[PDB]
Structure formats: structure tokens, C-alpha cells
Nucleic acid binder design. Structure first.
Ligand SMILES: [Li+]
Ligand SMILES: [Li+]
Ligand SMILES: [Li+]
Length: 1214
RNA sequence: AAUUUCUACUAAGUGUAGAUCGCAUCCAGUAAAG
DNA sequence: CTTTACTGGATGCGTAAAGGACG
DNA sequence: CGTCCTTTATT
């Protein structure tokens, strides 16, 4: 009955649930006594190292094989590639060449002798030890000799490097899809602009960059591509384009450089080259690890014995004898830094430039010109071209008798005598005696003095940097610059320390670093099947509502095997979990084993058809031998006791299957069982005592005895895993992991609210302004203690029954929906998200801003304005970088805000059976508050698509539609690509064009171009109007237009409009940068100012009788204000009104503000609401198309509203 | 101002409401400084 | 442009049972 | 020769 009700059980998805895991009894003691966690903590860091060691071999294998390759009909792919016109024939003759090109690369890899042990224990046990030379590196590898299985994850990531398929991860994809097309695009460019490159240049590149082994033109010939397959070749090639530095410090100009300098000297339109991409797994000052590392490298780079301090005392001596060197020989560079050097020497920021302005005049000024606006624009040009200022050119700017060269020594010594003072306050840090009282990140007092020192020293050197002076100058006093540049180049070492100490000290004080636990099992907790309980040494227990993970110690693997009691009262329950995982692989695996293929002796008919693949779809498909293979499979399952008993199969008659999938889908659906058997609590509790078993309660706060009220969605999912009413909607999956997360704080540094003192409540609509508890409350308590983490993957809808193309199903239901609602969601600079809900006729049902999230529970309505919060935390991030206090996390404030939004949209969807209309989003961002909102919207999209993959209402009875077992699926599986289209399920992506600047009452939009241009053009504008008159009864000027008389107005449906001088508009400063215009009185001012009797009927003739351009310019400016329907001021959040120059059916102008005031407004309340509304309306229009197509044609309907269709729809539907 | 984790919270007190796909790998960008 | 963290999309696994060495 | 680590199957 609702459209939603169709979208349950449509496709499967996976999720991971996270839990704390609490040791029970003495298992944390036993774990500590057997020092298991130290062992797992080390294994993790060893693991990191061996992977890098393996990668070293992986890289070498890739490399030599890539050098080995010569690509066959590479050159012929290139010939067909560059063809401008290519047939539908040869468009796909080419695309098969792409496939075979890639196939060649992968076959080169998989053809190598070694490939076979690249991802098996032999690479650890055999290949790598022979490959490495370091005895330590080899020892590190050998320490995994019993443990190679743990690398099974890593090895899959590496097998993907060697695939043929069009995957981001594939080497072949990088080579052919990405790198080769760039090379041929480069080939295109290089043959056009080859003329530009002088004979000198090509050979300079050939000499220094290429070693003279290859000519520069070789790298743009087709048959050289093979050279650039390896990274060694990519590095030469991108050096040719970008240039590079040889080790003499000579910068070598690359061809892009010569292209860019040609583009300026010629002022031409050249395309430069794009650089090629990195090759998979080649490896192209790093951040501090420890806390006392920082104290040491602080002390050791900045103490009084440091190199950095020595130059400080050396720079002091040079400036103390500043009088002695030549004032013609020292220079002050001319930069944006120049006005602060001016205000230090003379007192005013503009003195230096103004005095230079004076003497430029002395030579270049004659009184005839007086001055001109570009002769002063040509004096501004030469000042930015002055590279430097001599210490004499500054003294000649000085009036008597201020000595600029002694004043500059006062300024510098004032800067070093303050550095020594910061060395007084910082001395006890420098002693070895000093011991760190607190965590460094928490401990702001010492951090402030490190920053106090680093800041004053950085403040010093960047001041004196101006004394290099771009030099570059013919007669420097190298007496001075000699010592200066040695000191300056040493003093500059501080900036790396500066950034590195800052980045460490302003991290989050708590950390989420964890390391994986194995319990001496390389395949620990791999799966849950009962058959493998001992193999994985992990299983799940439960006591009433409380669930436990129980782990067998490696010495007592069978310790849960033989336990029973008849009463579950005071006894645990063992999970009895059986899985047949992926029949398509496990049925051939078992029945064609060497262990069993004798026992079930398959027909020589059966082997022929399995090997030849006659049961699969394709040309060699034969249904009757596919029946026979299914028949074989059913009868051997019947004699494979391990399956036949666990699942009591009830297959279809084999003659009702159309394909092999039909039977597999039946096996997989039935091949899963979960139950509980009783297990004595006494004997289990003792295993835990003795250290034969380790028990952790699976826990989150919903499991606490103090919990009332709604559980986490994820708590529902976990519990439902074992509920009898869950008939496979959610399966419990394998591949769980258990981690250990060491504490990163201690309670003693934690912020606390102590017991019995009253705490303030933060919501002001709550009349209980205080809460007072009987215990301490601590910020971030969860990080003040070690914590075990359990990750449990689940499988939602593992056997979907409702298979259909979701997009086409949404079209059919929409077609036959008498009143389909639409949710239009819009972003504006003023409003984070704006929302309008329309019914199936475009009636506004709801419209409001989501800048504030409203929530009501227990009658307490709280509003949380995330717009304010998002900006406040934004500014907390600029304050922390300068004050060196911990990052304010704004990544997550967005996620927190989006979480609220997503719940609200899903409640609107359920309430209205509505589809969503989303704004297509622009590439650029303009302002720094406007980016954070573009990302907020872009993150809103990702999460909203996700929730709509399996959309659950926690309130519902869990097996109702919309319940946790029957979640809705109204968006398609993938988040982004490539199945992307204009539509994703219920979501339709809508372009924004004329959704904002459009009168919603009339559909009127502005298609006139009113920029002044010329007097000559301005007369046909005024003369294309049907009439321009004055209506005294309304104090308005009417401009009656037929858009057919103007250019590029096809889009508009209603050709004829009458425009009026109604109300007011807001003008922008061209150089309070806004003034408010009153339209009708400005028209009278203009016509009165120039003598144009405006009360005389049609006045188009008289306006063109004027020939003062001052008139026409001002007339065209007023015309632009009348048609500017959206008026507002940026920054001020007050006005966003939308006013129209066109009258409606009942003869009244549209004013957004007439509706902003109301609470049940039938028209938009401002330009943002107008956008959302019209975003929804374009989807309504789409739905109309759906209603005009027959069902069989629905999936071909164009939902892309044309601008000409939109205007017609908007101009007709009201 | 507590959390598997995140956001906003604290109505009678160790919690409330909503959100929450992990782990590994590869790769692009984009900001800053010399 | 080099050094480095932030965040972004893309690829794989989410397994029991055959297979084999090994003390 | 039972135990524990590796390798296998692919709608
Ligand atoms: Li809750
Ligand atoms: Li607080
Ligand atoms: Li409560």
C-alpha cells in the first residue's frame, strides 16, 4: 500500500558492530601473568616492519617484470586512439584492445616463475630470507615462521595489484587506463608546441635530465611508452615536463616552464603537459613519536650550546657593528613585508613607498598631464618591480637627523635582547634535572614557554630575512652578507622544529591507537562454526541477557568440548553455529577433493561438464547437463554427514531450476543455523579461574543494569542475531576481531564534576537549571583505562528475494501514485540546509530551516543551533593553531549534525511516502565559511544514501515493515560510482538553474542583459519594449515587454510580461558597501534630472531622444535593479527577501517577507526556501513524464529538466 | 557532563536521544612552510 | 618542489574444510 | 598420528 512497503529484502549489505569487552574474574590477571598482551603489542609493530620488508621484494618483482615488457600492438592502439572520427565498430574494436593491452600486463606478471609463492608462506619462509642481507631484517621475518596465515589479508591487497581488471588498485589499470591516455594526450600537445622549443633547450634537457642517452622527442614517440611503465621511467618523464634539480643546485627548466614563459612573452594560449601518475608500491622531516623526544630535541636544538643559538650570538655581533659596513652595500628587499620595516624605521607604514613615489615623480613628471589614472597606475607598476632598497636609498628618505642605519640596529638589538629574556623564563626546561610533571599535550604551562621561545626566535629571523634583499645585486658588501647568510641559513633550521613540535603538542590528549589480539592463534576468531571452535579457540556464551566471548588458551583448546547440565538456571549456553559459506565454492571444493572424489565417483559426463562449464550462462550453456550436475550435488550432500545433518535440506525438484544459481541460492539460504546448548556454569567458571579459558562480557551501555529507554540501533542488531524471530534477515558473520586499546589519559588529569556539588544544565528552556548527583562525573573517562574492543561483522539480507532494478521500481510506483510527495533539500550560505515538502500538486506542506535541530523527548523541547556551533568550533580551530592548544575536532561536529539531519529526513520520508530532491553541487567554493558548508552538504549526501541502504525505525516491532529485521532499501548499494545516474533510488539529483532567482508565484525569470555597453545598443533595448509608461493610480512605472523582441529568450514560455517599479531593491558598492534603492523614486529622479516628461503616455521615443550617455548608463543600471529579484547582504543574516517586478493573476506583487512572517505559508518564505521548493518542483515535473510513459518504457524517461521545459512548467502550473 | 564510537545532552541518577561498516591496501588530490 | 598531516574515493576480506608438515 | 598451521573452492 505505501511505495516504501515494496523496498524490503532487496539486496544484501554488511555491517560491523563494535563493543567493549570486559574481562571476567581472574582472566585479566591470568592474561597479565602469561604476558599475552605485551606479546601481541610487539607482534603488531613487527608486523608493520615485515610488510614493508615484503613490499621491498614486491617492488623489485614489479620493476624488473615491467622493464621486461614490450607491449604488442601498443602502437596500433595508439593509432586508433587518436583518430578524430571513429565508427561504433571501431569504438569497440579499440576498447577490446584496451582489455588485451591490460591482459598482456597481467599475463606478464602471472607468467613469471615466482608469482606462485608471492602470497603463500614461502615468501616469508624462503624467498625473503634469501632476498634480504641484514641479519636483523632476516631475524624479523623469521619470527613469523609459525604465523604466515596472519598475512592473508595483506596478500589479497597485493594480488589486486596484479589484476587485469579496470580497478583503481590494479597495475595494469594504472599503466593503460590512466598513464597511457595521459601520454597520448601529451603526445598531442608536444607536436603542436614543438616549434617553441629552442635547439639549445632540448639539448640542455637531454644532457642533464636524460644523461644524453635519449632524445627529448623520444619520450613523445608512440613506441617509447614501454619505457615509462616502470617508475624509474616515470620519474625521468615528469622531470622533462616539470624540470628537476641536479645536485649542484642548478635548476633545470622543464618544457612546461618554457611553455609558461612563452605564454607570457607571447600572451598566447598554450596548453602545458600533464604529469604522469605514480606506479603502485614505489616509495617516493617526519613527525615525533615520544613525549621526552620532544623535550630532548627541543633542548638539543635550542639550548645555549646549540648551533641555532650560536648564530643568534653571531647575528648579534654583525648588527652591533652595523655602522661599519657600506650603506651602498646592504639591501632591504621590497615585499609585502616592506611597510612593517617602514613603520619600524620611520613610524608610518606608508612613508617608504610615499617617498619613493615622490622621487619617481621628479624624473618622470611634467605638469601638462597633471596626473592621470594610469600614470599613477604606471607608478604603482614600477614600485612592485623595484626589487630592493639600499641602506642609502633609505637614509636619503630619512629626514634629518634620524640615522636609519643606527635605528635599524636599535630595532634588531631590541629583538635579540628579548630573545635572551625568553631564555631566562625557559632555563629550567633546559637542565637535564627537569622532569615532565604532566603529559605534554595536557601540560599547557611548559608548552607555552617552548612556544614563547620558538616564537621570539622565529619572529627574529623572519624580520632579518628582508636584509637578504633579493641579491642578485651587483655590489653587495660581502663582508657583511658572508657571516649573515651562514647564520641565517642555520637559524632557518628552527622552522622544521617549530612545525614538528606544534603538530605533536596540539594533538588530541586521548588516543585511539590499538593493536590486534591473536592469543597465539594466527587465525584467531576466524569463524564461528561449531566444527572449528577449537581451531579458532573462540566462541560466544550467554547467561540470560548478558553475552560473553570465551577464548580458549592455546594449552587447553578442547576445554569447552565436554560440558553439560540439564538446567540452564545458573548455567551458560554454548552457541551452536553452523555455516555453509558460499556454495559455489564449497560444493566443488569438497566433492572434487582428492579426499572425496574417489568416494563419490562422478560420471565422466559430470567432470566433462564441470570442466567445460556447460552449467553456467553463456553460449556453451546446456540446461540438461546443468540439471545433472545439480543432481550430482544433491546426492553427495546427502552422503556428506557434516552437512546433511546440520541443515535438513528441502530442495526444489531439480527440474524446476533454470540455472545453477537457483540451486545454490537454496543451499546458501538453508546452510545457516544458530542455536544454544546448555553448558555448566560451575565447570566454565573454574576454567576461567585456572587460566584455561578467558571470558569477556560483550558490552555497551545498553547492557548496564541502570539502562532504561531505547537501545542503540546496533544493540538491536546484535540481540536480534540470536532471536528466534530472525529467520536469516541478519546473520552473524565470521572475521570478528578483538583489539586492545591502552589508556591515553589518567583520571587524575581528567576534568571532573565532583559528587554532590550541583552541575549546571545547558538547555535554557529546561526549568531544572541544575543537576546534582551522588558520584563523580568525568570527561573522557572511557580513555582513562585500558579497553578491549570487539568488532563483529554482520550480514543483512544475505538471501534477498525482492530482486528488481530499484530505480525502475521507483518510477513505476511513482507513475501510479495519485499524490506523490517530494522532499526538496537545499543549501544556502545563510542556511546549512533548507527543506520544503510538497504534495503531488506542488502544494507547500512544510518548509523550514535545518540550521537548528529540534528535539522533544520527556516533554523537554531543546533546540540546538548547529549553525552557530559549526562557526564557533570553526573559530576555535584558528585560535588553537596560534595559541598552540589542542585541535578542536570539527570533522565530527559535522557528523554529529548530519546524524540529526538524517534521522529527520528519514522520518519525513516515512511520514509522507516521499521521494527526495537534492541539489546538484558546484565544483568551486567561494568563501571559507562557504566551503565548510559545501563539505557539510557533501557529507550529508554520503550518510543519507547510506542510511537509505537499510533504513530502520527503532520504534517499530522488529519484524514489521520498517523494523530492524525488515529495513527499507530505497537507495542502491554503492555510495557513489559507477552505477550513478540522475536518480539513486528515492533520491533524484536536480540542477539548480533558476530555482532561486525565479518568482514562484508567476514563474517569471530575468532573461534580459542590462549591462550598459553603448549608447547605440541602449536605444534598441528601450525600443524593443512594447511600451514604457507611468501609472499614477499606483505610483509605478510599467515596462511592457515581449521577450520575443530580445535575444536568447527561447527558454521563456509566456513571451509577454509587464514589469513594474515596485518596492525596493538593494545595490552593491562598486568600491556599508550596500545602499538600498527605491525604484520608483529613482526613475523619477533620472527622468527629472535629464528633462524627460515621464507622465506622457508611451515614453520610449523620448528616452532615445537623449544623447547624454550619463542618462543611458543610469537608466540601464536602474533596469538591472528592478529585475534583481533576490536582494541581500552577505554577512548580515537578516535580509534574504525575494521580490518580483511582475504582477500575478490577482494583481499583487510577490514578497518573500509577506510569507516569512506567517507560520503556515503557502509560498516560499525566502530565496533559500524558494530554491528547495523549486528543486522539488522539477522532480514533480519528472514524475509527470513518468505518468506519460508506458511502464515498459519508464527506465528510459529523461528526468533532466530542460531550462525551456522548466520555465513552461513553472509558468503554467500556477 | 558519563558512551563500542560520535554529536547534543543530564527530571530525580553510573545514565537520555539520535546516529554509527570494520579491518587492510592502493591512490589521488587539497591546505601550509623552506 | 621537498618535506608532512589532515580528508576524499577505490580495491579486498568478513570461511569451513581440504591439504600438509611435524615433532 | 594427533595437533596445529596453510591453502583451497569460486553462482
Ligand atoms: Li539509549
Ligand atoms: Li562541561
Ligand atoms: Li534519565
Amino acid at each position: 500500500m505505501s511505495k516504501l512497503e515494496k523496498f524490503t529484502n532487496c539486496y544484501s549489505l554488511s555491517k560491523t558492530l563494535r563493543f567493549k569487552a570486559i574481562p571476567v574474574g581472574k582472566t585479566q590477571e591470568n592474561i597479565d601473568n602469561k604476558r599475552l598482551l605485551v606479546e601481541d603489542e610487539k607482534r603488531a609493530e613487527d608486523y608493520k616492519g615485515v610488510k614493508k620488508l615484503l613490499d621491498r621484494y614486491y617492488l623489485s618483482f614489479i620493476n624488473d617484470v615491467l622493464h621486461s615488457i614490450k607491449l604488442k600492438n601498443l602502437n596500433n592502439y595508439i593509432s586508433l586512439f587518436r583518430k578524430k572520427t571513429r565508427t561504433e565498430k571501431e569504438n569497440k574494436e579499440l576498447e577490446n584492445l584496451e582489455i588485451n593491452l591490460r591482459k598482456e600486463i597481467a599475463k606478464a606478471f602471472k607468467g613469471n616463475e615466482g608469482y606462485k609463492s608471492l602470497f603463500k608462506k614461502d615468501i616469508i619462509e624462503t624467498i625473503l630470507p634469501e632476498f634480504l642481507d641484514d641479519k636483523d631484517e632476516i631475524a624479523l621475518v623469521n619470527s613469523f615462521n609459525g604465523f604466515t596465515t596472519a598475512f592473508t589479508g595483506f596478500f589479497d591487497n597485493r594480488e589486486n595489484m596484479f589484476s587485469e581488471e579496470a580497478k583503481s588498485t590494479s597495475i595494469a589499470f594504472r599503466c593503460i587506463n590512466e598513464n597511457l591516455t595521459r601520454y597520448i594526450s601529451n603526445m598531442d600537445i608536444f607536436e603542436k608546441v614543438d616549434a617553441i622549443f629552442d635547439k639549445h633547450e632540448v639539448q640542455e634537457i637531454k644532457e642533464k635530465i636524460l644523461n644524453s642517452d635519449y632524445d627529448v622527442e623520444d619520450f613523445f614517440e608512440g613506441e617509447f611508452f614501454n619505457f615509462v611503465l616502470t617508475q624509474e621511467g616515470i620519474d625521468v618523464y615528469n622531470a622533462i615536463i616539470g624540470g628537476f634539480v641536479t645536485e649542484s643546485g642548478e635548476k633545470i627548466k622543464g618544457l612546461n616552464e618554457y611553455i609558461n614563459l612563452y605564454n607570457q612573452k607571447t600572451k598566447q594560449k598554450l596548453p602545458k603537459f600533464k604529469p604522469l601518475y605514480k606506479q603502485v608500491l614505489s616509495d617516493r622531516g617526519e613527525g615525533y613519536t615520544s613525549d621526552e623526544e620532544v623535550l630532548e630535541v627541543f633542548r638539543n636544538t635550542l639550548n645555549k650550546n646549540s648551533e641555532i643559538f650560536s648564530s643568534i650570538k653571531k647575528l648579534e655581533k654583525l648588527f652591533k657593528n652595523f655602522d661599519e659596513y657600506s650603506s651602498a652595500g646592504i639591501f632591504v628587499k621590497n615585499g609585502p613585508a616592506i611597510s612593517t620595516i617602514s613603520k619600524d624605521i620611520f613610524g608610518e607604514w606608508n612613508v617608504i613607498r610615499d617617498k619613493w613615489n615622490a622621487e619617481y615623480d621628479d624624473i618622470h613628471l611634467k605638469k601638462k598631464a597633471v596626473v592621470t589614472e594610469k600614470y599613477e597606475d604606471d607608478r604603482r607598476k614600477s614600485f612592485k618591480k623595484i626589487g630592493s632598497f639600499s641602506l642609502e636609498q633609505l637614509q636619503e628618505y630619512a629626514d634629518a637627523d634620524l640615522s636609519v642605519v643606527e635605528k635599524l640596529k636599535e630595532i634588531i638589538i631590541q629583538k635579540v635582547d628579548e630573545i635572551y629574556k625568553v631564555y631566562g623564563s625557559s632555563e629550567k626546561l633546559f637542565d637535564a634535572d627537569f622532569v615532565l610533571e604532566k603529559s605534554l599535550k595536557k601540560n599547557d604551562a611548559v608548552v607555552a614557554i617552548m612556544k614563547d621561545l620558538l616564537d621570539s626566535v622565529k619572529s627574529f629571523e623572519n624580520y632579518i630575512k628582508a636584509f637578504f634583499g633579493e641579491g642578485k645585486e651587483t655590489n653587495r658588501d660581502e663582508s657583511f652578507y658572508g657571516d649573515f647568510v651562514l647564520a641565517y641559513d642555520i637559524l632557518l633550521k628552527v622552522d622544521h622544529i617549530y612545525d614538528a613540535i606544534r603538530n605533536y603538542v596540539t594533538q588530541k590528549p586521548y588516543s585511539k591507537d590499538k593493536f590486534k589480539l591473536y592469543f597465539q592463534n594466527p587465525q584467531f576468531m576466524g569463524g564461528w562454526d561449531k566444527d572449528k571452535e577449537t581451531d579458532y579457540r573462540a566462541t560466544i556464551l550467554r547467561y540470560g541477557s548478558k553475552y560473553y566471548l570465551a577464548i580458549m588458551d592455546k594449552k587447553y583448546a578442547k576445554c569447552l568440548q565436554k560440558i553439560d547440565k540439564d538446567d540452564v538456571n545458573g548455567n551458560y549456553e554454548k552457541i551452536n553455529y553452523k555455516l555453509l559459506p558460499g556454495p559455489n565454492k564449497m560444493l566443488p571444493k569438497v566433492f572434487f577433493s582428492k579426499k572425496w572424489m574417489a568416494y563419490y565417483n562422478p560420471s565422466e559426463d559430470i567432470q566433462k561438464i564441470y570442466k567445460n562449464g556447460t552449467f553456467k550462462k553463456g553460449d556453451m550453456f546446456n540446461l540438461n547437463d546443468c540439471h545433472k550436475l545439480i543432481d550430482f550435488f544433491k546426492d553427495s550432500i546427502s552422503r556428506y554427514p557434516k552437512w546433511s545433518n546440520a541443515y535438513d535440506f528441502n530442495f526444489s525438484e531439480t527440474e524446476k531450476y533454470k540455472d545453477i544459481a537457483g540451486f545454490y541460492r537454496e543451499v546458501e539460504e538453508q546452510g545457516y543455523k544458530v542455536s544454544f546448548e546448555s553448558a555448566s556454569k560451575k565447570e566454565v567458571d573454574k576454567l576461567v579461574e585456572e587460566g584455561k579459558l578467558y571470558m569477556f562480557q560483550i558490552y555497551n551501555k545498553d547492557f548496564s543494569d541502570k539502562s532504561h529507554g531505547t537501545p542503540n540501533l546496533h544493540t538491536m542488531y546484535f540481540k536480534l542475531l540470536f532471536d528466534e524471530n530472525n529467520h536469516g534477515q541478519i546473520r552473524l558473520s565470521g572475521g570478528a576481531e578483538l583489539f586492545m586499546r591502552r589508556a591515553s589519559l589518567k583520571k587524575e588529569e581528567l576534568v571532573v564534576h565532583p559528587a554532590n556539588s550541583p552541575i549546571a544544565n545547558k538547555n535554557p528552556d529546561n526549568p531544572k537549571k541544575t543537576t546534582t548527583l551522588s558520584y563523580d562525573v568525568y570527561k573522557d573517562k572511557r580513555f582513562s583505562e585500558d579497553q578491549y574492543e570487539l568488532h563483529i561483522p554482520i550480514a543483512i539480507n544475505k538471501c534477498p528475494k525482492n530482486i528488481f532494478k530499484i530505480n525502475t521500481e521507483v518510477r513505476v510506483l511513482l507513475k501510479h501514485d495519485d499524490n506523490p510527495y517530494v522532499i526538496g533539500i537545499d543549501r544556502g550560505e545563510r542556511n546549512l540546509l533548507y527543506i520544503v515538502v510538497v504534495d503531488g500538486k506542488g502544494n507547500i506542506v512544510e518548509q523550514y530551516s535545518l540550521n537548528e535541530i529540534i528535539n522533544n523527548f520527556n516533554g523537554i523541547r531543546i533546540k540546538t543551533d548547529y549553525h552557530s556551533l559549526l562557526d564557533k568550533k570553526e573559530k576555535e580551530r584558528f585560535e588553537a593553531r596560534q595559541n598552540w592548544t589542542s585541535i578542536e575536532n570539527i570533522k565530527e561536529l559535522k557528523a554529529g549534525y548530519i546524524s540529526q539531519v538524517v534521522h529527520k529526513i528519514c522520518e519525513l520520508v516515512e511520514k509522507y511516502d516521499a521521494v527526495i530532491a537534492l541539489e546538484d553541487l558546484n565544483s568551486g567554493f567561494k568563501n571559507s565559511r562557504v566551503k565548510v558548508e559545501k563539505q557539510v552538504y557533501q557529507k550529508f549526501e554520503k550518510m543519507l544514501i547510506d542510511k537509505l541502504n537499510y533504513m530502520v525505525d527503532k520504534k517499530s516491532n522488529p519484524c514489521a515493515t520498517g523494523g530492524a529485521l525488515k529495513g527499507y532499501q530505497i537507495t542502491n548499494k554503492f555510495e557513489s560510482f559507477k552505477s550513478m545516474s540522475t536518480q539513486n533510488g528515492f533520491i533524484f539529483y536536480i540542477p539548480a538553474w533558476l530555482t532561486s532567482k525565479i518568482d514562484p508565484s508567476t514563474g517569471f525569470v530575468n532573461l534580459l542583459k542590462t549591462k550598459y555597453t553603448s549608447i547605440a545598443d541602449s536605444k534598441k533595448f528601450i525600443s524593443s519594449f512594447d511600451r514604457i509608461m507611468y501609472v499614477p493610480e499606483e505610483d509605478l512605472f510599467e515596462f511592457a515587454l515581449d521577450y520575443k523582441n530580445f535575444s536568447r529568450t527561447d527558454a521563456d514560455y509566456i513571451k509577454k510580461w509587464k514589469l513594474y517599479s515596485y518596492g525596493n531593491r538593494i545595490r552593491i558598492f562598486r568600491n556599508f558597501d550596500w545602499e538600498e534603492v527605491c525604484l520608483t523614486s529613482a526613475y523619477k529622479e533620472l527622468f527629472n534630472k535629464y528633462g524627460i516628461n515621464y507622465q506622457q503616455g508611451d515614453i520610449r521615443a523620448l528616452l532615445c531622444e537623449q544623447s547624454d550617455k550619463a542618462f543611458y548608463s543610469s537608466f540601464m543600471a536602474l533596469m538591472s535593479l528592478m529585475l534583481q529579484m533576490r536582494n541581500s547582504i552577505t554577512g548580515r543574516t537578516d535580509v534574504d527577501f525575494l521580490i518580483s517586478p511582475v504582477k500575478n493573476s490577482d494583481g499583487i506583487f510577490y514578497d518573500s517577507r509577506n510569507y516569512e512572517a506567517q507560520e503556515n505559508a503557502i509560498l516560499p518564505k525566502n530565496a533559500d526556501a524558494n530554491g528547495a521548493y523549486n528543486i522539488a518542483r522539477k522532480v514533480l515535473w519528472a514524475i509527470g513524464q513518468f505518468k506519460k510513459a508506458e511502464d515498459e518504457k519508464l527506465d528510459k524517461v529523461k528526468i533532466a529538466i530542460s531550462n525551456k521545459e522548466w520555465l513552461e512548467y513553472a509558468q503554467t502550473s500556477v
